[PDB]
Structures are given as C-alpha cells and as structure tokens.
C-alpha cells in the first residue's frame, strides 16, 4: 500500500528487540528478537542488527519496499536533559553519554543500538523516546527525595520514574475505553511485566510513580528487589565481603521473584505454587503484598480514583495476580467480577463488578506503537 | 508511700535519658536528660549516669528511699534473638554484642549504659526491652524482602521494625479509649517524633510497619531519608567521591527534614514556612506526601480499618501535620473535625468528625511507663 512505517528498536545488554509497525493502523509487519549477544553467533550489536535484517527478510519484509520513514530508539533514562522525543544527531548523542552514571546498566546498550542503526540506515531520521519523559514534571513533593539538598541538586538525584511510554499510552487507552475525556480522569496504572511499576495520574499529569532514581525502586519484579532499606548496602559491605557494585548487581539481577523462588517467569511460578513449593508461594505473597500497598498508597495520593488498569505481560494475562492484588478491598471501593477476570481474554476490558465504585480494567499496552506515533509527530506530523 | 518504681534508661551516642516512674500509678517522680556526652563536663557514660544521680538528688529523689525494684534499658535492635523483655546477665550481654553489625549506630550506646548501670546499681535486676520485639512475628509476606534468599537468611536480613513499645502501647490505649476489645480491632498507629514510623495492626498482631532492617526506612524523619532507591549508594560512590559509610551517614544524619530545610524541629519548620521559606514548605510537603502514602498503603493491608491514631512529639501536638496527612480522604472513609483537632490539647482524644467511617485519634504514647510495666512483669509480676 501507500502506508508509512517506523522501525522501533529496543537495544538491551544481551538482546535487541525490533518491530516494524504502521503508526496509523497499528499493524506490525514483522517483530522479533535477537538474543544471546556477545556470549554464540552474534558477538556484537552490529551483528545483531544485520541479523535482524535477515529475520525481516526471511519473514518477507524488504525495507526499501516498506515505506520506512523513521527509526525509533527506546532509551531508558533521559535524566533532566531529555524528556520529549528527540531527533538524533552527533551533538545530542554526546549529551546522552553524560547520563551514563545515572543509568550505567540500562543506557549504554541503547547508545550502541543508535550508533549501529545510524550507520547501517543513514537514509532516514532516527528518534530517541525516553522512558523517564512522561514523569519529568512530577510534582516536587513526589519527585524530591528527603536527602541533603546540596548533594541531591549537584548530582541530579530525584525520582525520575520509568515505563513512561506505557503509563501514558495505557492512561489514554483507559480514557478511550471509558469514553470519557482524559483531562477529567484520575487513575492508577499497574505495568506488571519483567520490570514492574505503578503510577498515579491526574488528567494528563502524573502525580507519583513507583520506580525512582533508577528502575530498581518500588514493586517486587522478576529479578529486582523493589523497595528495601538502603542500609542493606552498607550492611552487606560490612558483613558479607561484598563491594557496593556486587550489592547493586544482586539487587538488580538476583532479587525479586527469582531471588525468592529461583524462577523469574510468572507462569513457571504458578506451576511451582500448584505443586506445593513453599518458596514459590512466599515469593508470590511478597510480590502481592507490595503491590497491594502501592494501590492503597496511590488511592490516597489521588483522593478520588475513577479507574485502575492492569497492563503488560503479567497484568494482561495473570488472573490470579489481579484477583489477589485487589481482594478484600470492597471497603476501599474496589470489587472484582470473577467472570470478567477470566484468564486467556484479549482486548481492553472491564474486570470490576458493575457496581464497583472504582472501575478496574485490563488495558493492553503497546509501547512500540506509541513510540512509532511519537516519531511521526516530532518529524512534522 | 509503699510504692515501687522502675528507673528507665535510654542511652544514646551523645545523650542519656532517664525517668524514675511508678508502674501502677504512672506518675514520674523525676525525669531528665544528660547531654553533649564526650565532646564538655561529661566525657563518658560513667559520668553521665553519676551526673543523672546528681540530677535525681537536686530534684529531691533518694534512690534508697524510693522503692526501686528494677532498671529498664531501651535497646533498639534485638535481631531475631531477643524479642521479649530479657533479664540481663553476662551471657545475655555477650549475645547482644553479636547484634552490632545489624545496629552499629543505635545499639553500642545502650550496651555502655548497661555496663555502667549494672556496676553502679548492682542491688537490683536489670531488664532490656527491645524496640524490634513487637514486630518479631510480622507475617512472612511483610517481613521478607525480595532479595537473594541465601544471602538474606545467612546475614539475617529482614524487616525488623522499630518503635515497637510505642506502637504496642498506643494500640492498647486506643482500644481502651474506644472501650472495645483489642482483639477485635484493626488499626493504624503513626508515631511521628524524631524517628517517624507507621504500623498496621490486627488485634494483638502487627501486619506491617514502615521501618525496616534498620530505623532508616519508611517515613521522612527529622534527620533520616526514609524510603529511597538503594541505587543512590552506588551512584554516590561512583560520582561524588563518597564511600558507603559516608552515604549511610548522610542518609541517617543529614537527610529528612534537616536535609531539605536546614532544621530538624517541626516547630522551627512551621516558623520558616510562615515567613515564606520555600525550602521549608518543600520539606514539609515531601514529609506529608510520604505520610499520606503510608496511610493509604496500610488501609489496603488491613482491608477494614477501625481507627487511626497519631502519637509522639509531632503526632500529639502538630495540628497542621494531622490535617494535611488525611485531608481529601473523605472518599477513603476519613473525615477530620477542625474543633477536635485544635493545637495545645492534652489526653487521648477523637479528632475525627462524628460520622467518619474510620475513627481518628490522638493517643499520647508513654514508652517509659510501658517499659516499667514490662520489667515488673518479667520479674514475677
Ligand atoms: Mn514492554
Ligand atoms: Mn519517644
């Protein structure tokens, strides 16, 4: 057809995800992942993108015949410098390198992705979309940690927040599903995927969110601790023969659900629980307790809440998680309906009972589509 | 009279507080503080207790003529080893020394207090009461952090919780004020003093509390950060030329309200706010936002909440804090009455409106009295 398309890239430490997608229709011509980078047949990100071109081809796509208008790059951390979708050039990239102590785990891979893509696809505009952007204007009372002001301002320490593309997109789609204007709505979004984060949103403006300086803070996640006394770092440095980097690494990769149960995948977790694994049930109960607290905390932040929406891989599919996250909260205005909450369902949908004072939905997220539409917009429309 | 009395000691790094108190009547024959220890006329804790005997004398007390039956010692951290009031001897003390990496800031001073007191008052039983004790049996889902299980179990890492004496005592006094059995009540207690912590309590059993491995976690406090991404430690070690101990120290002493405003005392803070100090208003708003979240989180933990009680130096006296902590929560069941919430009031009292689905009280805490009654009990009654 005469349809235009964006190639959306999510470049991680050892993986590269891509989707070629039509921003007007939302259809994805092709999608895939290149894994096990630099361990194996794909030693670097240059090979990974070349390998992705093969995958696109053997899947029937020809990039010249496809209406390619831009390349979107997911960058986790924009600091206080980049919050809007940003057209990439050499100067911008130099400024991005200044963010790498704020995001030493998550940002450097995205920048490798950008270098490779701009070289192998120099014919088209490249755009960065930042996971922190939606949250740049959090209220000061929520964005500011209670630490020494001088040091916080000097090293740009604040609650940045992440999954900003998902939280924003889901908040818009919840408004659309309810057929009510976004500007008049107060809502909570629960993005429960590999990373897990919650947000409280009034109209178009977020009021709070669970991730922090980095994507470690907040909810229990697949491999991340979420909330824990920062004293654990000093404690382990003093007792367990660990340096600060060993502790940070453990909190990011050996914690969360995998730290408590030995698995990171929630389907695997449910199998373990059903076979009587005590550690798996504990891990699930720790996850669920943390999640319930954040829902409560955000009902209090908002004061009035119209809708709570579950999203991402767990939120979209795990009926038990959703049941256990809001059970016993009838007196707080939340009532779930068992039929509406059934597993295997697709599409934006109501899972609350009809008379629930607060509406509860599942609203599938589509970060790639939202990033494709951001790219299209910033390039003149 | 024929009245018996306990000398309750709270020994800190640079201070020693004491109160001589009648456990049956609750009257305090004498109370005071010895300050600026080892900086000055009182270089060590041996001098501080001798100096406290002077203070007791010049205030009209004679310890032999006073009915002294025990000495109570406040110990912050009991780990997993001590949770009930514990009669002190040399063996117990040896085991307490094993807790000093869990509590390097708070415990060592208490142990100096114990050594001095047992030497200068060898005629009577000495008892330790632990700030962690009330929380020893938190549910596993609340007590367990989502980190590597092996390492957590090896180094005894869990949510311990503190102000346990206050939370328990206030929960009992709230039941007494409402004339309803404790066992049937679900409640939240907000101990807002120098340290600040919240608890959620079902009957006689706590379900969660805001302090953690150490007294740093949770609410914003006078000089403590409360909740912050643990990544801040690694971040500052990598950027700001700080070691892990410098960061820990900053979070404990140069953070909270003093970190954001330059003052730690809430009366001073209110003066600054009233004169138009922007930093003081920000500090207050950060404190208040954190507090509102914990109230919300704990309403969700409990599912049904009968009563919320404010206590300690701020909770008992700062009407603005209490107003701002629960305003705009009518839809969550909380309605405050302006007349009932007036400053300067004394005694256990209702601050909610009559028709508030959830009752809100101020319930003055008396940790010394509760510790005196614990000492009396464990020594045969
Ligand atoms: Mn995703
Ligand atoms: Mn106190």
Residues 114-173 of A with CB under 8 A from B: 140-142, 144-149, 151, 154-155, 157, 159
Same domain, A198 and A293: yes
Angle (CA) B322 B323 B329, round 5°: 110
Same domain, A159 and A216: no
Judging contacts by C-beta atoms under 8 Å, the chain A residues touching residue B140 are 282, 285-286
- In chain A, alpha helices (H): 45-58, 90-97, 107-120, 140-143, 149-154, 164-178, 231-239, 244-253, 256-261, 266-274, 278-302, 312-317, 319-326, 367-378
Answer for the pair A148, B249: CB distance below 8 angstroms, yes or no.
no
d(CA A222, CA B364): 43
Same domain, B224 and B370: yes
Which residues are CB-neighbours of B51 under 8 A, at least 6 positions away? Answer: B34, B41, B42
Same domain, B37 and B56: yes
Q: Which ligand is nearest to the CA of B165?
A: 2
CA atoms within 13 A on the CB side of B93: 15
Contact B231 A248 (CB under 8 A): yes
Same domain, A20 and A138: yes
Q: In what order do the strands lie in the sheet containing B359-362?
A: B205-209, B196-202, B186-192, B307-311, B359-362, B349-350
Diameter over CA atoms, chain A: 65
Experimental determination approach used? X-ray
Answer for the pair A253, A223: CB distance below 8 angstroms, yes or no.
yes
Total count of residues recorded for chain B? 381
Same domain, A247 and A290: yes
Answer for the pair B17, B46: CB distance below 8 angstroms, yes or no.
no
Same domain, A185 and A221: yes
Q: Single out the residue in B179, B212, B240 at which a domain terminates.
A: B179
CA-CA-CA-CA torsion sign (A329, A333, A337, A341): negative
E strands present in chain B: 5-11, 16-21, 28-34, 68-75, 86-87, 125-130, 186-192, 196-202, 205-209, 307-311, 349-350, 359-362
d(CA A202, CA A214): 23
Answer for the pair B147, A251: CB distance below 8 angstroms, yes or no.
yes
Q: What is the CATH number of the domain that holds A277?
A: 3.30.420.40
Give me the domain span that covers residue A198: 180-381
Q: Single out the residue in B145, B179, B213 at which a domain terminates.
A: B179
Q: Which ligand is nearest to the CA of A194?
A: 1
Q: Which ligand is nearest to the CA of B17?
A: 2
Mutate to test the interface with A, among B190, B198, B224, B230 (most CBs of A within 10 A): B230
Task: Specify the number of domains making up chain A.
Answer: 2
Q: Which two tokens stand for residue B80?
A: 């997993």
Dihedrals phi, psi of B130, to nearest 5 degrees: -105, 130
Q: Which two tokens stand for residue A57?
A: 């081809």
Same domain, B54 and B106: yes
Q: Single out the residue in B179, B207, B226 at which a domain terminates.
A: B179
CA B33 – ligand 2 centroid, Å: 13
3-state DSSP assignment of residue A73 = strand
CA A340 to chain centre: 25
The residue from A44, A54, A90, A131 that is catalytic is A131
Same domain, B196 and B133: no
Q: Is B294 on the interface with A (CB under 8 A)?
A: yes
Q: Which two tokens stand for residue B305?
A: 């909440």
Residues 221-260 of A with CB under 8 A from B: 224-240, 244-245, 247-248, 250-251, 254-257, 259-260
**Angle between helices A107-120 and A45-58 in degrees, nearest 10:** 60
d(CA A345, CA A327): 20
Same domain, A128 and A229: no
Answer for the pair A181, A203: CB distance below 8 angstroms, yes or no.
no
Q: Which residue of A has its CA nearest to B255?
A: A147
Query: Of B155, B235, B290, which is closest to A213 when you measure between CB atoms?
Result: B235
Catalytic annotation present for A131: yes
Mutate to test the interface with A, among B217, B242, B290, B300 (most CBs of A within 10 A): B300
Resolution in A: 2.0
Number of H helices, E strands in chain B: 14, 12
Which residues are CB-neighbours of A379 under 8 A, at least 6 positions away? Answer: A69, A70, A87, A125, A127
Same domain, B111 and B249: no
d(CA A350, CA A337): 9
Same domain, B235 and B338: yes
CA A147 – ligand 2 centroid, Å: 23
């Amino acid at each position: 057809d005469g349809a235009r398309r964006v190639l959306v890239i999510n470049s991680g430490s050892s993986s590269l995800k891509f989707q070629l997608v039509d921003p007007e229709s939302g259809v994805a011509a092709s999608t895939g992942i290149v894994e096990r980078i630099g361990e194996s047949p794909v030693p670097d990100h240059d090979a990974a993108l070349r390998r992705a071109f093969d995958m696109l081809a053997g899947d029937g796509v020809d990039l010249n015949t496809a209406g390619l208008v831009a390349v979107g790059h997911r960058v986790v951390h924009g600091g206080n410098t980049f919050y809007r979708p940003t057209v990439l050039d050499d100067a911008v990239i130099a400024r991005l390198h200044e963010l790498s102590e704020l995001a030493p785990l998550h940002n450097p891979p995205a920048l490798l992705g950008i270098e490779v893509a701009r070289r192998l696809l120099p014919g088209i505009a490249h755009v960065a979309v930042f996971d922190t952007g939606f949250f740049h204007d959090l209220p000061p009372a929520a964005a500011t940690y209670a630490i020494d002001r001088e040091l916080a301002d000097r090293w740009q320490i604040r609650r940045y927040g992440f999954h900003g593309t998902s939280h924003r997109y889901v908040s818009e789609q919840a408004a659309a599903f309810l057929d009510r204007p976004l500007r008049g709505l107060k809502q909570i979004v629960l993005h429960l995927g590999n990373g897990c984060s919650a947000s409280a949103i009034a109209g178009t403006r977020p009021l709070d969110t669970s991730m922090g300086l980095t994507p470690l803070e907040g909810l229990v996640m697949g491999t991340r601790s979420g909330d824990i006394d920062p004293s654990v770092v000093s404690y382990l440095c003093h007792t367990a023969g660990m340096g600060v980097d060993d502790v940070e690494s453990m909190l990011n990769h050996r914690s969360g659900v995998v730290g408590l149960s030995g698995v990171r995948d929630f389907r695997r977790l449910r199998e373990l629980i059903e076979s009587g694994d005590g550690a798996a049930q504990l891990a699930y109960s720790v996850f669920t307790h943390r999640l319930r607290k954040y829902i409560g905390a955000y009902l209090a932040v908002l004061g009035h809440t119209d809708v709570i929406s579950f999203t991402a891989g767990i939120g979209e599919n795990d009926a038990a998680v959703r049941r256990d996250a809001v059970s016993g909260m009838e007196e707080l205005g939340i009532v779930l309906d068992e039929r509406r909450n059934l597993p295997g369902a697709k599409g934006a949908r109501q899972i609350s009972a009809d008379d629930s004072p607060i509406t509860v939905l599942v609203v599938p997220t589509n970060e790639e589509l939202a990033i494709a539409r951001d790219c299209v917009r910033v390039l003149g429309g």
